[PDB]
Scaffold this motif. Sequence first.
Motif, PDB file in Angstrom:
ATOM      1  N   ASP B 162       1.289  -0.796  -0.146  1.00  0.00           N
ATOM      2  CA  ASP B 162       0.060   0.398  -0.094  1.00  0.00           C
ATOM      3  C   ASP B 162       1.024   1.418  -0.086  1.00  0.00           C
ATOM      4  OD1 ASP B 162      -2.515  -1.213  -0.293  1.00  0.00           O
ATOM      5  OD2 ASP B 162      -2.899  -0.968   1.825  1.00  0.00           O
ATOM      6  N   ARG B 163       2.154   1.301   0.902  1.00  0.00           N
ATOM      7  CA  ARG B 163       2.572   2.563   0.644  1.00  0.00           C
ATOM      8  C   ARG B 163       3.387   2.611  -0.188  1.00  0.00           C
ATOM      9  NH1 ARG B 163       7.154   3.174   4.155  1.00  0.00           N
ATOM     10  NH2 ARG B 163       7.077   0.907   4.666  1.00  0.00           N
ATOM     11  N   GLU B 201      -0.790 -10.017  -6.778  1.00  0.00           N
ATOM     12  CA  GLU B 201      -1.333 -10.981  -6.035  1.00  0.00           C
ATOM     13  C   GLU B 201      -0.915 -12.529  -5.362  1.00  0.00           C
ATOM     14  OE1 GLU B 201      -5.062 -13.105  -8.588  1.00  0.00           O
ATOM     15  OE2 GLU B 201      -6.630 -13.183  -6.092  1.00  0.00           O
ATOM     16  N   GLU B 202       0.012 -13.286  -6.187  1.00  0.00           N
ATOM     17  CA  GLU B 202       0.433 -14.060  -6.005  1.00  0.00           C
ATOM     18  C   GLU B 202       2.006 -14.107  -4.545  1.00  0.00           C
ATOM     19  OE1 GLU B 202       1.714 -15.358 -10.108  1.00  0.00           O
ATOM     20  OE2 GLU B 202       0.199 -17.078  -9.980  1.00  0.00           O
TER      21      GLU B 202
ATOM     22  N   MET C  66      -5.979  -1.970  -5.372  1.00  0.00           N
ATOM     23  CA  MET C  66      -5.937  -1.090  -6.499  1.00  0.00           C
ATOM     24  C   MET C  66      -5.275  -1.840  -8.365  1.00  0.00           C
ATOM     25  SD  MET C  66      -8.457   0.379  -6.036  1.00  0.00           S
ATOM     26  CE  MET C  66     -10.081   0.921  -7.056  1.00  0.00           C
ATOM     27  N   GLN C  67      -4.185  -1.723  -7.236  1.00  0.00           N
ATOM     28  CA  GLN C  67      -2.882  -2.318  -8.785  1.00  0.00           C
ATOM     29  C   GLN C  67      -3.778  -3.793  -8.985  1.00  0.00           C
ATOM     30  OE1 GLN C  67      -1.090   0.409  -9.634  1.00  0.00           O
ATOM     31  NE2 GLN C  67      -0.393  -1.236 -10.294  1.00  0.00           N
ATOM     32  N   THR C  72      -6.751  -7.973 -12.690  1.00  0.00           N
ATOM     33  CA  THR C  72      -7.549  -8.463 -13.293  1.00  0.00           C
ATOM     34  C   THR C  72      -8.255  -7.831 -14.213  1.00  0.00           C
ATOM     35  OG1 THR C  72      -8.061  -8.976 -10.783  1.00  0.00           O
ATOM     36  CG2 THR C  72      -9.636  -9.337 -12.214  1.00  0.00           C
ATOM     37  N   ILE C  73      -8.610  -6.686 -14.292  1.00  0.00           N
ATOM     38  CA  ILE C  73      -9.558  -5.731 -15.795  1.00  0.00           C
ATOM     39  C   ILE C  73      -8.623  -5.905 -16.892  1.00  0.00           C
ATOM     40  CG2 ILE C  73      -9.327  -3.855 -16.661  1.00  0.00           C
ATOM     41  CD1 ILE C  73     -10.463  -2.276 -13.743  1.00  0.00           C
TER      42      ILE C  73
END
Lengths: 208, 208, 208, 208, 208, 208
Positions: B162-163, B201-202, C66-67, C72-73
Motif C-alpha cells: 500500500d505505501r 496477487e501471488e 487497486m493495482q 484482473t481488468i
Amino acid sequence: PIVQNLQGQMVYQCISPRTLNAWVKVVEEKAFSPEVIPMFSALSCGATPQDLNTMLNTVGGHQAAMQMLKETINEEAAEWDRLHPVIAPGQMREPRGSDIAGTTSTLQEQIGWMTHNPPIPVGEIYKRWIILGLNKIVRMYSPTSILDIRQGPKEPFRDYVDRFYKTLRAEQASTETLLVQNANPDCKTILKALGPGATLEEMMTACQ
Amino acid sequence: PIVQNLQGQMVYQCISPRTLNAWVKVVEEKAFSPEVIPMFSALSCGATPQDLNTMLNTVGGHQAAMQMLKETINEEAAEWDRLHPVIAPGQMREPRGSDIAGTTSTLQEQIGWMTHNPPIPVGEIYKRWIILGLNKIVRMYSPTSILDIRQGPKEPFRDYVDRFYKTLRAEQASTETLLVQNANPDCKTILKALGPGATLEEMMTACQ
Amino acid sequence: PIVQNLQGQMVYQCISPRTLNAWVKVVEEKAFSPEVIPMFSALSCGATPQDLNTMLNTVGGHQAAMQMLKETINEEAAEWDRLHPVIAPGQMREPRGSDIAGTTSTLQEQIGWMTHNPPIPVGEIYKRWIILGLNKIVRMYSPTSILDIRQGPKEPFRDYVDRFYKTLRAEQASTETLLVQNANPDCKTILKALGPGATLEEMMTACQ
Amino acid sequence: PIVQNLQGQMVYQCISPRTLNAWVKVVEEKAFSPEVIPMFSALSCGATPQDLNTMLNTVGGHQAAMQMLKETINEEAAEWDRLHPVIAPGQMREPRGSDIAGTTSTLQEQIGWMTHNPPIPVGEIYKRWIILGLNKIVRMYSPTSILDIRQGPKEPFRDYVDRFYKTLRAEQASTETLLVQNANPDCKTILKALGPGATLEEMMTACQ
Amino acid sequence: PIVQNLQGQMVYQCISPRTLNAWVKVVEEKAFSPEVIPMFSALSCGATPQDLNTMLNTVGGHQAAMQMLKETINEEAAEWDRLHPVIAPGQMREPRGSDIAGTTSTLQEQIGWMTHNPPIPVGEIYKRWIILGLNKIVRMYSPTSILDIRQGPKEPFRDYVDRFYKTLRAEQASTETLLVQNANPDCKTILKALGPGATLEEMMTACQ
Amino acid sequence: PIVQNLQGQMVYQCISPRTLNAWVKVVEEKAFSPEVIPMFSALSCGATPQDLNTMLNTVGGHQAAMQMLKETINEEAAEWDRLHPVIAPGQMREPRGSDIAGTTSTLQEQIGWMTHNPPIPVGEIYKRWIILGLNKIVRMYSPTSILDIRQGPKEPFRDYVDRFYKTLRAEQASTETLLVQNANPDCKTILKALGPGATLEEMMTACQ
C-alpha cells in the motif's frame, strides 16, 4: 434566481435553503478571506437584486463591513444615475441606481428587466457593485503587509510561499523579486544562484 | 456547467452548492494527494471555463500551488495561440488561449463555443491544462522517493505494498523488481523463490 | 451515468457529488468488507466506463488492492480481445478490451455503444470485470478461516452464528455441519439432539 | 408554496423538509437576532398563508414572542377588514383579514386567490404582517441601547464598529457622530482630526 | 425502483445514495427493532427484485439474520413454484420463484413484468416474502417475554406502558388485563377500581 | 404522497428518505411537545393513508402513545361508518372507516379516491383523525398545570411569559389575568398599574 428550467425559457426560482445556508456558513467560517468572494459569486449565480439583498441581509455579524458595503453600493448607484438618467401604461420603465440595488424596484420589475430582449442585466450589474465593495473589505481586513511575510529559519520554503501569496491575494496585487528578498539566508543563496527568469516551480524545487 | 436537461438540448446550469462545498472540502482534507485530481475532474463534469475558475478560486489555502497552476495555464495558453492564431456582426469569434482559460471570454461566449455544431470544447481544453498543472503539483508535493519505501521488520506485506504504490502514484510512474528489493529479509526470500512472472496477487498471497 | 430522463430517451448525466462522496466514504469506513461490493454496484448504476474509472480513481488508500484490480481488468480485457477480435466515416467502431475498460475510448464512444440499438453494454461488461476483481480482493483481505470461528464458552449462539456467516461471506463459499462442530460443548449437545434437517431458525431457537 | 414548475404555470408544492428544518434550526440558533427576519422571508418564498402558519407553528420555544406576533397579526387583519369590507355558486369569494392569515380560509382558496388573474397575493400580504410583527419582537429583545455601546480602551476599532452597527440594526434606526462620541480617547482624537464628511471606510482606516 | 416520472409512464430509476445510506444506517442503529420493517418497506417503495437484493446485500452485520431470511425466501419461492408452475421469440416468459427473488431474472425482465398490462408485480411479491422473513427475525431477537414486563415500585405508569407495548410489538401479538396484572400494587388498586371497559387513555390518566 | 408533477396531473410519489428521517428525528428529539403536530402535518403534506401509517409505524418509542392513537383512530373510523354506511365490475367502491385508516384499502384504491373528480380526500380525513389523537397525547403528556407556572423572584418576565404560554399551548386553551396573578410581587405591582386592556407587548415592555 433566474434559471433556465428543464424545458427552455428563463424563469424565477426561490433561493434554495442549501444556498442560503452555504452562504451564511462560509461567512461564519472564513469572514472576509479573499476566497469568500468567488464563493459569493458562485452561490449568487442568476440572482435578482432581491436575491442578492437576501444573501447580504442574512449575515448576522460583520455589520461594520455591511455598512461599508452599503456606502460602496450607494456610490455606484449614484454613478449609474449620472451616466444613465431617466409611466407609459403596461410598459417597462428604465431602472435607476436604487432599482438596480433592489431598494426601490419589485421582484416582478427585476425579472422583467433581466428576461427582456435585449436583457437589462440588473442582477449582474448589482453583483459587480457588491463584489467591488467586498474586495475593498477584503483589503481592509487583510492583517499583514507583504513586507512582513518573511521566511523563518526552520520554515519550509513551500509554507513560506503559501503565506506570501495568501497575503498578496488579500492585499490584492495585479513579485518574484520580493519573494527572494524575504526568503531566509539559506534559501536566498540558492535562489540567487538560479538567476533571472526562474519559474516558481523551479524556485520551489531548488529550495525543497 | 452545461447539462442535457430532462428534455434534450445542452443548457447552462449554475454550479450547485453541493459541488462547490465538495471541492472546497476535498482540498481541505486531502491537499494534493493524487486522488484529488480525479475528484476535481468528476466535480467539474460539463464545466465552462468560468466554472473551472470558480472552483479554483474558491480554494483558500495552497496559494503557492495556485500560483504554479497559473504559470502552467499561461504556458498552455501561449502554446494554443502559437498553434491556433486568429469582428463580423452577430458571429462567433475564434477563441484565443486567454478565452479558453476564461480570463478574456464571457460566459455567453463560452456557452456559444461549447454548444456549437461542431462543438469547440473550451471547457474540456481548459480542464486538460488544469489537470496537467495539478499533476505537476501532486508530483512536487509527493513527500517520499520510491527508493525510501522499504518494508519494516514487523510490517505486514500488504501495508508495505500500500505505501509502495501510494508513493508510485504520487511520484507518477508509467516496477515489481523494486517491490521485491525493498521488501524485508523474510518476505524477500519468499518472493525470490516464486521466480519471474509472479502476479501481485501471488506475491501478496505468498507473504500473507 | 446513462439515465432515462423524466421524458424517455437514455441520456448521460454527470456523477453526482453525493454518489462520489458516498463511494469514497464507504471505502474509508468498510475497506474491503464483502458488503462494499453490492454498495459499489448500486452506486455505479448506469455508469459508463469513464464513470467506473472515476469511482475507482477517487480512492486514495488501498493502492495494493487497486493495482491487483488493474491486473484482473487487464486479464479480462485480454480474454475479450481473444473472443471478440476487430474506420468507416461517421460509423461506430467495435470496442476492444481497452475500450470497455475506458482507457482507449472516449465518453462519446461509450455513450454511443451503450445507447445503440441493440445496445453494446460496455458499462455493464466493465462493471462485471471490476466486481470479479473486487471479489478476489475481498477474499484475500478476509482475516480469518472459517475453521477458526468457534463459539466461546460464554458467547451467545447468535453472536457466534453472526461471526460464522460473516466469515463465510468474506471467504466466499457457495455448511450447517461445521456450524455445529464449531459450537461450544453446551450448544453442540443441544444441536446434536435436534437431528438432521434442522433449519438455522430452529438451531438458533434451541440455543437461545 | 406556489412554484413555477419546469414547464410554466404556477402550482402548489409542499414545503420541503429542508425548508422546515432550516427555519426551526435558525430560530433555535439565532432566536430573534435581526438577521432571522431576512432568513424567514427567504425560506417562505412563494408561501401560502397555510405555509406561513406551518413555519410559525413549528417553533417550539419563544411562545411569548409567538403570542405577541398573533396580536400584531390580529391588528393588521382588523385594519384590512376596515379598508376592504365584503356566495355565488362556483365563484371566488373576497378574502377577509382572517382569510389572509389562513385561520378561516382553505389551502384551495388561498391557491385560487394567489393564482388569479389579476392575482390577489394573500401570501405576500400575510408575510408583510408577519414581518411587521417579527420586527417588533427583534426590537423588544434587543439587549442594549446604542448609548451603551462604547469602545473599550484595548478594543480594536473594527470590533467596536461591529458592536455599534449590530446594536443599531436590532434597535432599528433609519449616526456617524455618535460613533465618534462613543469611541475611546485615542480613536476619538484621530476621528475628530479627519473632520466632517469622512466615510466609515476612512474612519476605520484611520483607527486601524 | 420503478417511478412515475414527471410526465407519466412508469420507468426505472437507480436507487439513490440517500436511500442506500438511510437503509444501511437504520440497520446499524436499530438492528431488528420492530420499527425497522416499516422503514424497510418505505425505503424500498417501487423496488424491483434487484433493488431489494441490493438493499439486503449492503447490510454488513447480522449475517445470521440474513441467512435466516434466505431460508424464508427459499420456502416462499418453493410455494410459489407449487402454485404457479411454468421460449416464444420476443415474448415475456412467466416468472418462477427464483425470478421473483431476483436470482435467476434480469433487471430488464423484472421491469417488463412490473410494467406489463396487467402488471405482474414481482417487486411487491418479493417484498412480501422479505417482510415475512424480517418479522420472524424481529420475533426471534425480541429480548423479553411480555410476562416479564412488570411495573417498578417507583416507575411512572407511562414508562411501564411504553415498555409493555414495545415488548408486545416485538413479540408480535394480534391485552389490557395483563397490563393491569403486571402493574405495581398502587397502580393495580387504582386500575381495578376503574372496572371493565376502561380505555388506555383513562388508565394512564388514573395512574398519572 | 400525491404530488402535482412538473407538468400537471396529480400522481403518487414515494415518501422521500429525507421526509422519513425528518419525522423519526423530530419524535426522537421533541417527543410530544405541541410543535411536533404542525411538523407532522407539514411532513405528511399530500400523504395517502398508507403514507400516514408508514410515518406512524416508523416511530420506535412511545408505544403507549401509539396504542392510544390507535384507539382514537378506531373511534373516528366507527363514527365515519355510522354517518357514511355502504362490487360493480371496474368501478370505485365507497370507503369505510378502515379504508380511510389504510388497514383494509390498497394504495391503488387510496390514489383512486384522492384523485377522483370530485375527490374523496381519504388522506386528509385520516390526517384529521390522527391529529385529533396526537392532540390528546400532547395534552396528557403536558407535565405542568398553568396554575403552577409562577414567576421566580429573579426570573426575567420574558422567561416567565415563555414558560406560561409554552404550558398553555401543551394544556391546549382556546388568559392575561392569570399571567398577572402568577407574576412575582415587583412585576405584579407594575402590571396592576397599567390597568385593563394592556397588550402583552405593553406588559413585557413595562416589566423589562
